[PDB]
Amino acid sequence: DMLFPVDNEARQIKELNGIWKFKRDNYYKQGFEEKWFEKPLEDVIDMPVPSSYNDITTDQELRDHVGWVWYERKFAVPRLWKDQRLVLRFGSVTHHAVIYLNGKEITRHKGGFLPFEADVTEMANEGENRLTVAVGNILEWDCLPVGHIEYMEQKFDFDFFNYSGIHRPVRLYCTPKEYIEDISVRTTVDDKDGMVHYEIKTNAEEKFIKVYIRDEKNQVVAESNEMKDMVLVKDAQLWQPGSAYLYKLDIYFGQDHYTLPFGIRTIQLTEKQFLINGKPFYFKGFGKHEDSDIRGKGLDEALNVRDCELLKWIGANSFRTSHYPYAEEMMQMADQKGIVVIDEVPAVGMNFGIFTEDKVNEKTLAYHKQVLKELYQRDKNHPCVVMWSITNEPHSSEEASRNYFEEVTKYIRKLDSERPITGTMNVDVEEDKISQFFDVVCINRYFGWYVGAGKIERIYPSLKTDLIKWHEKYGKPVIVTEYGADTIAGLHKLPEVIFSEEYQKRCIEENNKAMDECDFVIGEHIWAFADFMTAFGLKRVDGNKKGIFTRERQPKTAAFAIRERWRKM
Amino acid sequence: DMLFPVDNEARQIKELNGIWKFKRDNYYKQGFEEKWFEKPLEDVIDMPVPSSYNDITTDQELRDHVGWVWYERKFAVPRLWKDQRLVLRFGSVTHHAVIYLNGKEITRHKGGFLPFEADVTEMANEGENRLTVAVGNILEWDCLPVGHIEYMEQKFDFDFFNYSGIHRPVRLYCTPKEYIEDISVRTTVDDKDGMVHYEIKTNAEEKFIKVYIRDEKNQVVAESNEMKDMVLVKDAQLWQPGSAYLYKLDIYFGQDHYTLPFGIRTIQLTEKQFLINGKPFYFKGFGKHEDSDIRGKGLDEALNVRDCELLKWIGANSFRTSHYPYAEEMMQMADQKGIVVIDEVPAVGMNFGIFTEDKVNEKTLAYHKQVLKELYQRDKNHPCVVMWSITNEPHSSEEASRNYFEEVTKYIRKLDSERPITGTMNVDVEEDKISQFFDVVCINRYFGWYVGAGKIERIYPSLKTDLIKWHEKYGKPVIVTEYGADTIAGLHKLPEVIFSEEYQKRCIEENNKAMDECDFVIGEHIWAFADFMTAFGLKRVDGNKKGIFTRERQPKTAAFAIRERWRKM
Ligand SMILES: [Ca+2]
Ligand SMILES: [Ca+2]
């Protein structure tokens, strides 16, 4: 149950962002042992919310902290909210949360990239309250992303910095006590007419509802009094890639009111094409990251607008949420700009045996299904989402992974019978044991970088050969979901060398030549959109330098050649 | 015989540098099999000499060439040289040479860092002559440095670019037909008095000779008519680190004349000290390279003066010739500037079983002794050379390496009974099997970089422990011959991260703290002096970035903290 909070005449949002008080444990779980939540925090510093905490201070100990940290602020409940339902919402807490209201625990959460909330109607006092949030960053074999602890040092095999903090907005909001809990929308098209299937869940199903469908002019085009209905939109304005159209499911229920934007669009996979509204779609874009200077993974909407301007400028039509769900604000923006999205759960780091009883096991599986349920509940109504990605680069050569991912694939397909399912490959085509469960084959391939570094002449034959093998083995359309080269801005050389701006351009260009000679490729996603931070390592010059743009969102040389190609496509 | 050529009333040098014609093979050994030397080269480009050829052109195929290339120019013999002995000298040809004069082969050479010559008295014509030089860059298991060919790709394990070309001056010179062939000088000191032991070898030994010893104002201070003698120098000005004094052995022999600079200084080792003229010497400096922009490993005397100015500025007193003998010009400069040198043979890359019948074997051994003989013959008379280094980072954990390096160390001790012998370690101290053969133990250690990257607080405990183990195992004084961290100029961060300027400074500090607590450490050589080029690899951002100075010889931040330490030491 996770409708995005709204403001209208009936519902109201109180943002709890700004500056909080903050302190870290000085030994493992010190805050829980000493019950720091039972009184205000002492010996604290300021910490912005939303933001990672790791890059804010000058303190290497805080940057590299392993374990739990403690946030605290105060909030008020006005007299005017006296008889309302009160909800405290967290867009995310990375990775693990324990929430305390006035010294008492009210909820917990596992998973750093999906929202959660707590009903505090009967617990919050009028006037001042104290909100205390314990934030833990430890990843074990039953978390997503996967990791483990050694003796404490945090180990993991994914390539992005394990930022921790309150990365997304914290909201206290009110609704009437009889209210709209959940909404599902599915759409079909018969030539010119759209059909809108909706289902609305309330906590008083016998009472009266009024449902409108409004166009972008806010004009009513359909109307009903049923909580579940199928309604026809004559001459429907379809939601198109690069040309969004959003209708509004506008719902009056008792004293309550909720308005849900949605797009009318169809998806169909053929043998070798990806069809949106019947017309072939070729993915041009990037896997991204929630990453920028100072604030780590913290939501930054000005950064988001800049990134969308860059995506439009360079001719991209799509992105993948590597390697975790992004903020709903980004998903709303993609809905509005007509950007096509591959939505991914954080099942990353399942690589180096990995699928064994003492590591990635049935407990990991059950949590993997739960994360998918939550992702679906949050994003099921976004027209921008066209595909679910259930994993990034698992060690799928292991025979034990076959049963694991058959279970995961069956689960998401039971939740959602309409969008294709996929996941990205890094093992050899000959060894993979899971891609047969997918509708689209996605491969991460770094010819000219991790294979044959510097050997420009070998990139084109290498990727073409591999692509054909992937198509011959599975007979499905193929997306190259990652390829590129680390590139230091300002590093030029003639003849070109790895890390130079010229090499990045040539590397991408030869990979593209291989893709252009295949008839079953339905997309190219360059890695990476922008330089981002990684865990420290000798192959990472202050992070991952595969960005086509710098971390400050300025283009390297290759960006202009990619634009010339994508704008002609 | 390898006396450095001189100009005087009796001997004359003609430099053959400038711009040659140049062309590479298009398939393996093409010029040999098509017999290109028989006529002037056709379809050629210009190539400077001395210089590597790899970074001169815009052509990747030449930069990465494997095999042979061809150089050619014309030279003149003047009428005035009619009755002289004529010698063609190459300072070096990297790696393999075949020399042709007017289309006939006159000599060959294996080894890219030591000089060779050919008597051309009987073959050169008056007036114009055609000089053709085939230059090969293939390294095999019995070459130094070590490498091997796979299927044609060059493999090797050392960490510097395999530049090829004619890196040092080419000289045609004349002497009388009866002439001075070789000179050896050894010195002892008795209070304030030097004894100069010398031994002159000539072309006609029964004839009469006159030997003067001259001070720096050109005044005779000893004299003799013997080919072999000891002559006393009372109140002898000693050659001192940082304050050089050079006498001259001035020899007249028939029509011939040769003047040999030399220095009076003594070396002695105790179990905790390195004594030069009785005073303890603590090595402060760097392993270097012959490397600069555009010209690869080509000799550049302006660059050498700038380097020596920077060594003086930073308070360095020494360098090691990593990992091959340097140009004699640099050795003369060290003689004149009072810089102490560890002189090293190119026995690098014997690492990844290495010491096996099929790899490093008896052929490599015999060649290793041969290069030591040649290095000793060239540099025996340099006061700046205080120690021979016979290897860099061999895989000396193999039992088979024990007998190998016992042979090598025995041999160099037979050539030179006065200078200490060493070789640099990278294997674990518990595994090493050869350092008992050395007079000084030298270790390459990168705590904070290759071990425990980024963990500043573990550098000091890690190196101190390792240092004490090396001393406990062998009971000899220890030089840390390499330590440091890759550093991108302009990369700053707070807190610091690997690759940042601030990290390089802290990493060297913590290593220095460990050395300051170990009384048996007699030297600290930072790696590296200046950023230099490497074979391409994902850990090498346009080469090796451990330079304290940039490749263009400007300091990074850590240079100023090093200077403070070394100048007050
Ligand atoms: Ca959010
Ligand atoms: Ca020379």
Paired residues of B284 in beta bridges: B524
Q: B79: CA distance to ligand 2 center in Å? A: 27
- Coil, helix or strand for A420? coil
Interface test with B, best of A506, A541, A545 (most B CBs within 10 A): A541
The torsion defined by the Cα of A7, A11, A17 and A20, in degrees rounded to 10, comes to 170
Which residues have a Cβ under 8 Å from the Cβ of B543 and sit 6 or more positions away? B161, B531, B532, B533, B534, B551
Cα Rg of chain A, angstroms: 24
Which residues have a Cβ under 8 Å from the Cβ of B454 and sit 6 or more positions away? A536, B448, B497, B498, B503
Chain A residues inside the 8 Å CB shell of B486:
538
Nearest-5° Cα angle at A497, A492 to A498: 105
At A317, list the tokens: 């039509």
Report H helices in A242-361.
Answer: 301-313, 328-337
Q: Where are the domains of chain B?
A: 12-175, 180-268, 269-568
Q: Which of B158, B160, B226, B172 is nearest to B196 (CA)?
A: B226
8 A C-beta contact, residue B128 and residue B339:
no
What is the helix (H) or strand (E) element at residue A479, kind and residue range? strand A478-482
Question: Which whole-number Å values give the CA distances from A415 to A217, B79, B362, in the listed order?
Answer: 33, 98, 71
DSSP state string for B111-173? -SSS-EEEE-TTTPPSEEEEEEEEEE----TTSSS--EEE--EEE--SSS----EE-S-EEEE
Q: B166: CA distance to ligand 2 center in Å? A: 11
The distance from CA A365 to its chain's CA centroid, rounded to whole angstroms, is 20
Report the residue numbers after which chain B has a gap, meaning the C atom sits over 2.5 angstroms from the next written residue's N, or none: 151, 352
Size of interface A-B (CB pairs under 8 A): 57
In terms of C-beta distances under 8 Å and separation of at least 24 residues, what long-range contacts does B58-61 make, across chains too? B58/A494, B58/A495, B59/A495, B60/A456, B60/A495, B60/A496
At B104, list the tokens: 């006939």
Half-sphere CA count of B68, side-chain side, radius 13 A: 20
Omega cis (within 30) before B323: yes
What is the helix (H) or strand (E) element at residue A512, kind and residue range? helix A501-516
- Distance (Å) from the alpha carbon of A456 to chain B's nearest alpha carbon: 10
- Distance (Å) from the alpha carbon of B317 to chain A's nearest alpha carbon: 31
**Residue B485 main-chain phi, psi, to 5 deg:** -155, 145
**Residue A397 main-chain phi, psi, to 5 deg:** -80, -25
d(C-alpha A381, C-alpha B174), whole Å: 91
A→B interface, C-beta within 8 Å: 58-60, 63, 449-450, 453-454, 456, 486, 488, 491, 493-500, 536-539, 541-542
Closest CB to B63: pick one of A495, A536, A537: A495
Asked if B494's CB is within 8 angstroms of A542's CB, the reply is no
Annotated binding-site ranges of B for Ca(2+): 328-329
d(C-alpha A21, C-alpha B289), whole Å: 53
Interface test with A, best of B542, B545, B546 (most A CBs within 10 A): B542
d(C-alpha B374, C-alpha B178), whole Å: 24
Resolution in angstroms comes to 2.2
Asked if B453's CB is within 8 angstroms of A537's CB, the reply is yes
Pairing of strands B274-276, A96-101: unpaired
- Distance (Å) from the alpha carbon of A76 to chain B's nearest alpha carbon: 37
Closest CB to A453: pick one of B63, B538, B541: B538
Q: Is the dihedral of CA A437, A441, A445, A447 positive or negative?
A: positive
- Coil, helix or strand for A108? strand
Omega cis (within 30) before B528: yes
Report H helices in A37-169.
Answer: 60-63
Asked if A539's CB is within 8 angstroms of B539's CB, the reply is yes
Closest CB to B536: pick one of A60, A497, A538: A497
Question: Which whole-number Å values give the CA distances from B140 to A247, A297, B16, B137, B402, in the listed order?
Answer: 72, 51, 30, 10, 22
How close are the terminal C-alpha atoms of chain B, in Å?
A: 41
d(C-alpha B131, C-alpha B97), whole Å: 12
Which residues have a Cβ under 8 Å from the Cβ of B340 and sit 6 or more positions away? B241, B276, B281, B283, B317, B318, B334, B384, B386
Which chain B residue lies closest to A533 (C-alpha atoms)?
B497
Positions of B marked active-site: 393, 482
d(C-alpha A304, C-alpha A330), whole Å: 7
d(C-alpha B336, C-alpha B339), whole Å: 8
8 A C-beta contact, residue A263 and residue A505:
no
Catalytic residue among A290, A393, A510, A524: A393
Q: B6: CA distance to ligand 2 center in Å? A: 12
8 A C-beta contact, residue B362 and residue B397:
no
Q: What is the 3-state secondary structure (H, E, C) of B498-510?
A: CECHHHHHHHHHH
In terms of C-beta distances under 8 Å and separation of at least 24 residues, what long-range contacts does B368-375 make, across chains too? B368/B144, B368/B408, B369/B407, B369/B408, B369/B411, B371/B111, B371/B114, B371/B144, B371/B345, B371/B346, B371/B347, B372/B345, B372/B408, B372/B411, B372/B412, B372/B415, B373/B415, B374/B2, B374/B111, B374/B114, B375/B114, B375/B325, B375/B343, B375/B345
Task: Tell me which residue has tokens 């993979």.
Answer: A432
Interface test with B, best of A54, A55, A60 (most B CBs within 10 A): A60
8 A C-beta contact, residue A554 and residue A545:
no
DSSP state of B458: G
Residue B27: count of CB within 10 angstroms of its CB: 10
Closest CB to A541: pick one of B59, B449, B488: B488
Asked if A58's CB is within 8 angstroms of B494's CB, the reply is yes
Give the ligand at the shortest distance from the Cα of B114.
2
DSSP state string for A82-103? TTSEEEEEES--BSEEEEEETT
d(C-alpha A72, C-alpha A129), whole Å: 11
8 A C-beta contact, residue A332 and residue A309:
no
Closest CB to A58: pick one of B59, B491, B495: B495
Q: A32: CA distance to ligand 1 center in Å? A: 27
Angle between helices B328-337 and B362-379 (to 10 degrees): 50
Question: Which whole-number Å values give the CA distances from A249 to A133, A312, A431, A510, B283, in the listed order?
Answer: 35, 28, 47, 47, 79
d(C-alpha B362, C-alpha B358), whole Å: 10
* Total count of residues recorded for chain A: 569
d(C-alpha B80, C-alpha A328), whole Å: 90
DSSP state string for B233-291? ETT----BTTB---EEEEEEETTEEEEEEE----EEE-SS-EEETTEE--EEEEE--S-
Interface test with A, best of B446, B538, B544, B551 (most A CBs within 10 A): B538
| Residue A181 annotated to the active site | no
Task: Tell me which residue has tokens 């660059």.
Answer: B303
d(C-alpha A48, C-alpha A19), whole Å: 4
Pairing of strands B478-482, B279-280: unpaired
Which residues have a Cβ under 8 Å from the Cβ of A467 and sit 6 or more positions away? A443, A478, A480, A514, A515, A518, A520, A521
At B415, list the tokens: 């050539």
Report H helices in B390-500.
Answer: 400-415, 459-474
Tell me how far apart the 2 most distant CA atoms of chain B are, in Å: 75
Paired residues of A47 in beta bridges: A20
d(C-alpha A379, C-alpha A372), whole Å: 10
8 A C-beta contact, residue A16 and residue A172:
yes
Residue B192: count of CB within 10 angstroms of its CB: 10
Cα Rg of chain B, angstroms: 24
- Distance (Å) from the alpha carbon of B17 to chain A's nearest alpha carbon: 26
8 A C-beta contact, residue A389 and residue A320:
yes
d(C-alpha A56, C-alpha A292), whole Å: 12
Q: Which of B510, B506, B496 is nearest to B463 (CA)?
A: B510
- Distance (Å) from the alpha carbon of B534 to chain A's nearest alpha carbon: 11
At A369, list the tokens: 């299904």
Chain B residues inside the 8 Å CB shell of A538:
449-450, 453, 486, 498, 539
Which residues have a Cβ under 8 Å from the Cβ of B442 and sit 6 or more positions away? B389, B422, B423, B424, B425, B478, B479, B480, B481
* Edge-to-edge order in the sheet of strand A274-276: A267-269, A274-276, A279-280
d(C-alpha A483, C-alpha A489), whole Å: 18
Asked if A494's CB is within 8 angstroms of B536's CB, the reply is no
Which chain B residue lies closest to A539 (C-alpha atoms)?
B539
In CATH terms, the fold of domain A269-568 is TIM Barrel (3.20.20)
Q: Which of B522, B450, B436 is nearest to B481 (CA)?
A: B522
Asked if B538's CB is within 8 angstroms of A498's CB, the reply is yes
Asked if A60's CB is within 8 angstroms of B498's CB, the reply is no
- Distance (Å) from the alpha carbon of B542 to chain A's nearest alpha carbon: 7
Q: Which of B300, B396, B384, B381 is nearest to B347 (CA)?
A: B396
Asked if A536's CB is within 8 angstroms of B497's CB, the reply is yes
8 A C-beta contact, residue B479 and residue B320:
no
* Domain covering B180-268 in this structure, CATH number: 2.60.40.10
Q: Is the dihedral of CA B211, B215, B220, B221 positive or negative?
A: negative
B→A interface, C-beta within 8 Å: 58-60, 63, 449-450, 453-454, 456, 486, 488, 491, 493-500, 536-539, 541-542
Domain B12-175: CATH superfamily is Galactose-binding domain-like (2.60.120.260)
d(C-alpha A114, C-alpha A2), whole Å: 10
Method of determination used here = X-ray
